[PDB]
Amino acid sequence: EGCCTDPRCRYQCYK
């Protein structure tokens, strides 16, 4: 969801 790249989302790529 174009979030994995982000640091905050990177922590939880699978939500």
UniProtKB/Swiss-Prot annotation:
RgIA[Del13]dimer is an analog therapeutically interesting because it is the first dual inhibitor that potently and selectively inhibits alpha-9-alpha-10/CHRNA9-CHRNA10 and alpha-7/CHRNA7 subtypes, which are both involved in the etiology of several cancers. Disulfide bonds join C3-C9, C4-C13. It is found in: Secreted. Expressed by the venom duct. Changing Y11W: Relatively important increase in potency on human CHRNA9-CHRNA10 nAChR. Changing R10K: No significant change in potency on human CHRNA9-CHRNA10 nAChR. The disulfide bond CysI-CysIII is important for alpha-9-alpha-10 subtype inhibition, whereas the bond CysII-CysIV contributes to GABA(B) modulation. Negative results: this toxin shows a weak activity on alpha-7 nAChR (IC(50)=3310-4660 nM). It also shows a very weak activity on alpha-2-beta-2, alpha-2-beta-4, alpha-3-beta-4, alpha-3-beta-2, alpha-4-beta-2, alpha-4-beta-4 and alpha-6/alpha-3-beta-2-beta-3 nAChRs (IC(50)>10 uM). This toxin target two types of receptors, the nicotinic acetylcholine receptor (nAChR) and the G-protein-coupled receptor GABA(B). It specifically inhibits the alpha-9-alpha-10/CHRNA9-CHRNA10 nAChR, with preference for rat receptors. It interacts with the alpha-10(+)/alpha-9(-)interface of the receptor. This is Alpha-conotoxin RgIA. It comes from Conus regius. The chain holds residues 19 to 32 of 32 of the full protein.
